[PDB]
Design a protein around this ligand. Structure first.
Ligand SMILES: Cc1cc2c(cc1C)N(C(=O)CCc1ccccc1)c1c([nH]c(=O)[nH]c1=O)N2C[C@H](O)[C@H](O)[C@H](O)COP(=O)(O)OP(=O)(O)OC[C@H]1O[C@@H](n2cnc3c(N)ncnc32)[C@H](O)[C@@H]1O
Length: 643
């Protein structure tokens, strides 16, 4: 399944047209189904050609010469399919050699705000489509939230660092195009408690199994018993979790109660049984006395005998039904149900898994929408997640080649009228001087964190619509930070990619909870997640580094941990050009706000467009999602301005 593999790798069903294709090829969708079969094959075959060699441009001509008969005969259809794929960035995207050099005459002028992956991806597209495009970047570097520290042989990422599984991922293509070195993340992640001692394989697996059950339970509560609203306020994932933990504690307590009752019932039956046995002894003594007096005794002894014995066929008979209790009893007081749901240490290890989830969503669990936090799960790529061994910055740096990028240029105002656009920016090195860039269309790739900023960092004239600003306000924008520790010696386990540090309280579970071993040089990355991420931004590098060394010394022993030669600490929330790490579906929002974010603002025809990780519903908060959003908008614009 080569052509089949291609559809897959492009995130398309290999045997049916998508709604997009139906819209663009209405004559094929509503027409002979035999012609649809041909369409799909032409489409899957062109994707294959491009994906097999993403380093070179795939022209309309070269596609025609490589299709086999009878397909290479339908010149018009092939062209219609090739243009559609190219326009929408499914082929000829990223960085590749042009065999058809760009035309000197550039049609339409577009200003892209932001030189991060979404902006660079869109930039290159628009440029290859023959448009005039300039990017205005506030930082003194490209990449935005993809940031790599490089000094000597030290390489460490302060922004994105993980690639999520190649099958279906457009980064698979970019990876080959920029020669980026990827390494699969080894699953083994040892956990150490606050005292520095490892958590036993047993408990590790047990708590992780509870973590999974607890989550599955919230999913059931949400998508089945529709428990998504309480007191008119939407329910958060954190909220649902604590409720499910409570029910578990209640159940444990209930089985504890029932058991104690079995003990007490058995204990009463015994006490009562002992008491009548004592009375039967007192009844037997009444006989092993009296019994012995006269001459009729040959009948009086027989009598007192078959009498005194019958009271033993009674007594030791009770000692029997007595042994069946002491047995039942000792068996119960030896097999008690669980005393608690989670011990105090167990709850700490569980909190580690929760911090892990707060890392992934870049936000405290109490802020996540119980119903839509994992709204995009259905679009995951297949395969192992990888790590970028040579620094993820190699991507935006390569995507920047040949583009007109203006660094240290912070946009402060965006005016869009029914007949053109003006973007006002200021040099960040001399806020004295401003710049005024005229253009036909503005592509805003500003982070949702900047768009939420109050007072506003950039102004919109006219102001953006209420349906757009309301969406910006509902959506969540998280935070996540890393501490890069650069040493001259490796004192950790070189075979382990990651290891965890379990925190002492629920509140600080996200403080330096996960360490990463990813690079050539002796470097360790420590994560700060959930509630701890924003707070820690207020502590200086030195103090924060200190706390890392302490954790580290508690695990490998002091004297094993030397002082770092170099350290880098991110503070994404404080970063004016970001205002956080990435979006998350907040409670009260949903995947529809990601769609609304993508909507262009048009006063008589579309003028203001949007891209960036917060504008792609099926791939939010990711580097690839940022890439696709870029390709998406370059398409939407070329359609408006070039047709
Ligand atoms: C900050 C951050 C972000 C991410 C991560 C860690 C951290 C600490 N990574 C993760 O830890 C994992 C995430 C993850 C998520 C999902 C699955 C698996 C993992 C991570 C991860 N994503 C991913 O796929 N794998 C990852 O490994 N993210 C998120 C991505 O970094 C992010 O979604 C993506 O880079 C966003 O790109 P955009 O183009 O949408 O935004 P940005 O790069 O910020 O571009 C905006 C530009 O605008 C510029 N700018 C601003 N204000 C102005 C102005 N006024 N004028 C002119 N220019 C301006 C600003 O400086 C930027 O250059």
């Amino acid at each position: 399944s080569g052509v089949e593999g291609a559809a897959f790798q492009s995130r398309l069903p290999h045997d049916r047209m998508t709604s997009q294709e139906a819209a663009c090829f209405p004559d094929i969708i509503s027409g002979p189904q035999q012609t649809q079969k041909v369409f799909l094959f032409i489409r899957n075959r062109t994707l294959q050609l491009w994906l097999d060699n993403p380093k070179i441009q795939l022209t309309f001509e070269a596609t025609l010469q490589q299709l086999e008969a009878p397909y290479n005969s339908d010149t018009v259809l092939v062209h219609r399919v090739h243009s559609y794929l190219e326009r929408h960035g499914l082929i000829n995207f990223g960085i590749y050699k042009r065999i058809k050099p760009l035309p000197t005459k550039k049609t339409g002028k577009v200003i892209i705000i932001g030189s991060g992956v979404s902006g660079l991806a869109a930039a290159r597209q628009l440029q290859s489509f023959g448009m005039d495009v300039t990017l205005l970047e506030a930082r003194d570097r490209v990449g935005g939230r993809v940031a790599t520290f490089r000094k000597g042989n030290y390489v460490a990422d302060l922004g994105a660092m993980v690639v999520t599984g190649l099958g279906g991922n457009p980064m698979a293509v970019v990876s080959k195009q920029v020669n980026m070195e990827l390494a699969k993340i080894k699953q083994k992640c040892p956990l150490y408690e606050a005292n520095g001692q490892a958590v036993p394989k047993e408990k590790d697996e047990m708590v992780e199994q509870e973590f999974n059950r607890l989550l599955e339970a919230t999913s059931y509560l949400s998508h089945q018993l529709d428990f998504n609203v309480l007191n008119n306020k939407p329910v958060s994932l954190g909220q649902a979790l604590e409720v499910v933990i409570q029910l578990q504690e209640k159940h444990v307590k209930d089985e504890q109660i029932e058991h104690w009752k079995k003990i007490v019932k058995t204990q009463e039956e015994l006490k009562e049984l002992l008491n009548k046995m004592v009375n039967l002894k007192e009844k037997i003594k009444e006989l092993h006395q009296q019994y012995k007096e006269d001459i009729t005794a040959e009948f009086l002894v027989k009598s007192k005998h078959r009498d005194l014995t019958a009271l033993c066929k009674e007594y030791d008979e009770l000692a029997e039904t007595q042994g069946k209790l002491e047995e039942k009893l000792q068996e119960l007081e030896a097999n008690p149900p669980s005393d608690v749901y989670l011990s105090s240490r167990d709850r700490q290890i569980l909190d580690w898994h929760f911090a892990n989830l707060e890392f992934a969503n870049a936000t405290p669990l109490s802020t996540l929408s119980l119903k839509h936090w994992d709204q995009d799960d259905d679009f995951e790529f297949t395969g192992s997640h990888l790590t970028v061994r040579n620094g993820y910055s190699c991507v935006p740096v390569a995507l920047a080649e040949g583009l007109d990028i203006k660094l240290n240029t912070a946009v402060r105002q965006v005016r869009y009228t029914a007949s053109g656009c003006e973007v006002i920016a200021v040099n960040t090195r001399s806020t004295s001087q401003t710049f005024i860039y005229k253009c036909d269309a503005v592509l805003c790739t500003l982070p949702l964190g900047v768009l939420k900023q109050q007072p506003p960092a950039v102004q919109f004239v006219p102001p953006l619509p209420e349906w757009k600003t309301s969406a910006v306000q509902r959506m969540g924008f998280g935070n996540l930070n890393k501490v890069v520790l650069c040493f001259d010696r490796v004192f950790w386990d070189p075979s382990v990619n990651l290891f965890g540090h379990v925190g002492s309280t629920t509140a600080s579970r996200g403080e330096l909870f996960l360490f990463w071993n990813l690079y050539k040089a002796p470097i360790l990355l420590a994560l700060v997640a959930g509630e701890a991420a924003g707070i820690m931004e207020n502590i200086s590098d030195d103090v924060i580094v200190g706390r890392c060394l302490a954790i580290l010394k508690g695990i490998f022993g002091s004297s094993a941990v030397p002082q770092p030669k170099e350290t880098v600490v991110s503070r994404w929330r404080a970063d004016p050009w970001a205002r956080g790490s990435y979006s998350y579906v907040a409670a009260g929002s949903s995947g529809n706000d990601y769609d609304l974010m993508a909507q262009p603002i048009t006063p008589p025809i579309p003028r203001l467009f949007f891209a960036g990780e917060h504008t792609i519903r099926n791939y939010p908060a990711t580097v690839h999602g940022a890439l696709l959003s870029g390709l998406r908008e370059a398409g939407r614009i070329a359609d408006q301005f070039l047709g």
